[PDB]
């Protein structure tokens, strides 16, 4: 059975290692090539000032969300083996699907 895997990482460097680990754990289970979802840019522009006094300077805050595409043809136990096998780094999105 083939299971869909999606990983969302805010920091590109933190997901960069995770994608390298994903190939080095599921190679026998034939993990899919890591297509990268186009960045989802969460953008908030807020006036920098607590008040509205002074020039209207704007504070731009952006969270870039990166996502990767993975599929593994393996047993029900085998995805769980890769889920334990992949490098665990904190604050990551883990997806198990059918």
């Amino acid at each position: 059975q083939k299971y869909t895997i999606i990983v969302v990482g805010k920091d590109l460097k933190l997901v960069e290692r995770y994608v390298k680990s994903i190939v080095k754990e599921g190679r026998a289970f034939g993990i899919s090539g890591p297509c990268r979802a186009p960045v989802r840019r969460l953008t908030i522009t807020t006036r920098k000032s607590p008040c509205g006094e002074g020039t209207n300077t704007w504070h731009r805050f952006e969270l870039r969300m990166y996502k990767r595409t993975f599929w593994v043809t393996c047993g029900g136990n085998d995805i769980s083996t890769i889920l334990s096998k992949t490098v665990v780094i904190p604050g990551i999105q883990v997806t198990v699907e059918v």
Binding site: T45, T55, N56, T57, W58
Partner: protein
């Protein structure tokens, strides 16, 4: 319409041998040459029929620089997606010239068609990047700011 897998998705089989591109002002064009009877079509529309009627001459400049012999055998299929009307005619010209260059690229004869075309018109071969700038706060444009009331 922006740099997707659209480049090869339009045609299945009918393999084209020479691939070329022409991209300016966000208008990107992918040109595929099967080297048949020499006819050129852009976006399913024959190159001799171009939507701007004055800008058919701009599109037919690569063809005007070299003799009929070069285009006698080069069958080009072009696909321009995105950008704008004028950025699409400008893109077409760049792609047609990349197609002639790709036919004679291995020989030192690539130099002859690059010199003649470029000398008559710059950007026939090259593509001037000139991308659009970003609006900044306090203005309606990158170089334009709102009128100042006092002083």
């Amino acid at each position: 319409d922006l740099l997707e897998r659209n480049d090869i998705e339009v045609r299945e089989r009918d393999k084209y041998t020479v691939h070329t591109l022409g991209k300016k002002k966000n208008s990107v064009a992918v040109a595929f040459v099967k080297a048949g009877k020499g006819d050129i079509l852009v976006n399913n529309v024959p190159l001799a029929l171009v939507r701007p009627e004055i800008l058919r001459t701009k599109v037919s400049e690569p063809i005007m620089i070299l003799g009929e012999s070069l285009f006698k055998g080069l069958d080009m299929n072009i696909k321009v997606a995105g950008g704008g009307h004028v950025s699409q005619i400008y893109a077409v010209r760049q792609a047609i010239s990349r197609g002639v260059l790709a036919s004679v690229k291995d020989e030192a004869a690539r130099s002859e068609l690059r010199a003649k075309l470029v000398s008559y018109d710059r950007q026939l071969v090259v593509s001037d990047p000139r991308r659009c700038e970003a609006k900044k706060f306090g203005g309606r444009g990158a170089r334009a700011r709102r009128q100042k009331s006092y002083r």
